[PDB]
């Protein structure tokens with residue numbers, strides 16, 4: 001991370017151009033450049049890059065992700081004074097408190113609403129149950145009733161929760177991580193209703209954010225479900241729209257999750273004071289929030305003064321009506337596992353590949369499962385796993401067990417005794433498990449239970465994966481002269497010795513080179529060595545140079561692992577020439 005500037009990550013559905021305008025004002029006053037980026041999957045990328053001390057100085061996301069980041073030590077504790085805190089609503093600060101510490105600045109409160117086309121549907125439906133009949137009416141007129149994003153569980157949750165579904169039970173000021181409400185009767189009822197809509201062709205399981213937005217904004221469907229960030233595109237489309245309370249289900253309100261868009265500071269940032277100045281004195285002001293809100297609406301902002309100014313907007317009132325029928329998202333680390341579990345359940349049930357009951361049963365199990373620490377190790381290198389709670393020397397009451405490619409199911413280990421397991425995984429004096437040289441067959445789960453004389457029990461739970469770095473990639477079978485107007489084989493990139501497979505990518509003039517566009521094609525193959533299990537990849541690049549184009553291209557190929565266990569590897573560049 002570069003000292004003396006600010007890099008900000010925010011999702012691509014938010015007002016990033018407006019935020020960049022706030023950054024320009026900061027730059028005018030301070031000379032400090034503010035770069036706003038909107039990477040894909042930034043909420044998954046952040047914990048990867050920040051864990052190694054890289055990433056943005058500031059990350060924006062709803063507050064639900066932040067407990068996990070904080071637990072991993074990826075966030076700086078913020079230091080607003082009490083006078084600053086008093087400028088924002090107390091419930092918004094609660095959303096960004098983790099283990100007693102403020103770990104992000106709250107920006108705005110979001111909830112989904114029903115958005116409807118007033119020219120098609122003057123009185124929007126009060127119930128989910130009336131939507132099939134409404135769709136039949138509209139289909140007869142060449143339209144449809146409802147389209148919304150069915151790929152992300154955020155959008156389907158309000159219906160799943162209505163009749164009794166919940167994420168984690170809240171009681172005594174705490175979430176019970178084992179009391180999950182994903183496969184109860186209420187969740188099943190809601191998801192069954194959704195799936196029936198799809199079975200009856202009132203909705204399509206493939207509908208995503210872009211498809212639903214396009215259909216609504218072109219006047220093809222009478223309703224959608226979306227948040228405040230979507231309003232600006234509807235304004236542009238000129239559709240005469242209203243924003244209103246979500247339909248009820250079985251007579252009960254839909255319960256959207258309430259998200260607080262929040263800004264965290266990277267623990268690894270050398271620019272923490274600049275970040276504080278930007279967030280407190282530039283962004284969290286009437287003029288700062290206005291700039292962002294004018295780009296894509298924020299909802300009900302956390303800053304009291306500006307929230308009061310905008311409160312008269314009936315779309316914001318509807319957002320708050322819906323929010324106040326729903327639940328605040330927990331910020332606990334287990335929220336990630338909950339969302340992944342429910343995403344899978346909804347996709348599998350909606351596609352018909354699994355019953356609602358079976359999909360939700362699996363999701364329940366996954367969401368409530370004990371957390372495991374992800375461990376990675378390079379093939380051939382040693383690995384040490386701590387038995388938390390064990391005394392530093394014997395006697396120790398502990399038990400290691402594992403479930404890997406070397407075992408059928410669970411194997412319980414014993415103290416060293418000369419048996420063959422001792423050369424693969426053995427218990428050290430301090431109770432740790434030592435694997436002298438990991439291999440592919442060691443991937444799996446490793447667990448320790450340590451018991452103390454006072455009755456204390458401590459469990460350690462590890463999910464172990466391994467990797468190998470291939471040799472530097474090479475380009476072979478390359479053609480140094482290219483002919484415009486016909487396909488030319490630039491060469492074949494080859495990488496040998498990876499685990500897992502990884503992928504090869506081509507680049508032209510220091511930018512990625514995209515297949516099937518502008519006369520580019522790639523033929524790829526993967527081979528696995530029968531004994532070692534390591535992978536060899538090939539990627540053959542064809543290009544059709546355009547006549548009059550740049551006759552001096554520079555190509556290169558790189559290998560990347562799926563997860564960043566190591567850096568990309570690159571070939572030397574090649575510089576074939578286009579000759580007439």
Ligand SMILES: OC[C@H]1O[C@H](O[C@H]2[C@H](O)[C@@H](O)[C@@H](O[C@H]3[C@H](O)[C@@H](O)[C@@H](O)O[C@@H]3CO)O[C@@H]2CO)[C@H](O)[C@@H](O)[C@@H]1O
Pocket residue numbers: 011013043044062063064065110151152153154155227259336339340343
């Ligand atoms: O579905 C897989 C997905 O799950 C998790 O994403 C959840 C977000 O963490 C949660 O905030 C919410 O996201 C919505 C934003 O709050 C809202 O501002 C707007 O951007 O729409 C978002 C939904 O698309 O809900 C999602 C679950 O749908 C997890 O964090 C992700 O890594 C994972 O991809």
